[PDB]
């Protein structure tokens, strides 16, 4: 009920209105987002509370209610879609051919798409609609342009 | 702070998707803080 599959905004509020700090994915009863979005704070979902279950600052990932479930991988060849959920805007799909981050721990697909801070955690999809990673941990090249890793956890 | 979630959509690939962005090959390092940088 409070964990139905889908993409969700992560919001904060106090005694006034709400601000979107990120996005995440509900799959198999587990909520998935980036560590920098929530810092491991508990999340309200309707009348219920979701508590962090697993997370890792270096990977910049966190899961709630259970272990990380998303395991689809970019195939290194195909176009992908960012299902961007920008603050104040409807969810939208943006198709792109990833580049790569070449790292000492392997190649990571990387999308040269620039969306605001609160879009962090938006899912990146393969052609079957599976989530191959989350958007929003990236680099900035010399001219200022942004490139995000396709950040995926381990199931 | 009330941090909460609200539905934004169903997770699907959209065949009518705008295609954009380049495809860079970048040498990158990841530090223990979770920050990527260019090598």
């Amino acid at each position: 009920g409070e964990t139905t599959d889908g993409v969700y905004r992560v919001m904060t509020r106090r005694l006034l209105g709400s601000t979107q700090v990120g996005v995440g994915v509900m799959q198999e009863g587990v909520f998935h987002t980036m560590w920098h979005v929530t810092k491991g704070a508990a999340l309200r979902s309707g009348e219920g509370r979701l508590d962090p279950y697993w997370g890792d600052v270096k990977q910049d990932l966190v899961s709630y209610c259970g272990p990380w479930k998303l395991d689809a991988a970019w195939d290194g060849l195909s176009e992908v879609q960012l299902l961007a959920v920008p603050p104040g805007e409807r969810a939208k799909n943006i198709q792109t051919l990833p580049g790569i981050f070449k790292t000492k721990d392997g190649d990571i697909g990387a999308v040269a798409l620039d969306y605001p801070a609160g879009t962090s955690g938006s899912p990146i999809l393969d052609k079957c609609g599976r989530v191959i990673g989350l958007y929003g941990n990236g680099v900035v090249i010399k001219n200022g342009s942004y490139v995000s890793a396709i950040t995926q956890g381990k199931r | 702070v009330d941090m909460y979630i609200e539905r934004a959509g169903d997770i699907t690939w959209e065949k009518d998707a705008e295609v954009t962005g380049n495809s860079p090959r970048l040498d990158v390092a990841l530090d223990e803080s979770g920050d990527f940088s260019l090598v």
Binding site: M34, A117, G136, N137, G138, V139 | -
Partner: peptide
């Protein structure tokens, strides 16, 4: 980006 690279 825009909280830096996040």
């Amino acid at each position: 980006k825009g909280x830096x690279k996040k």
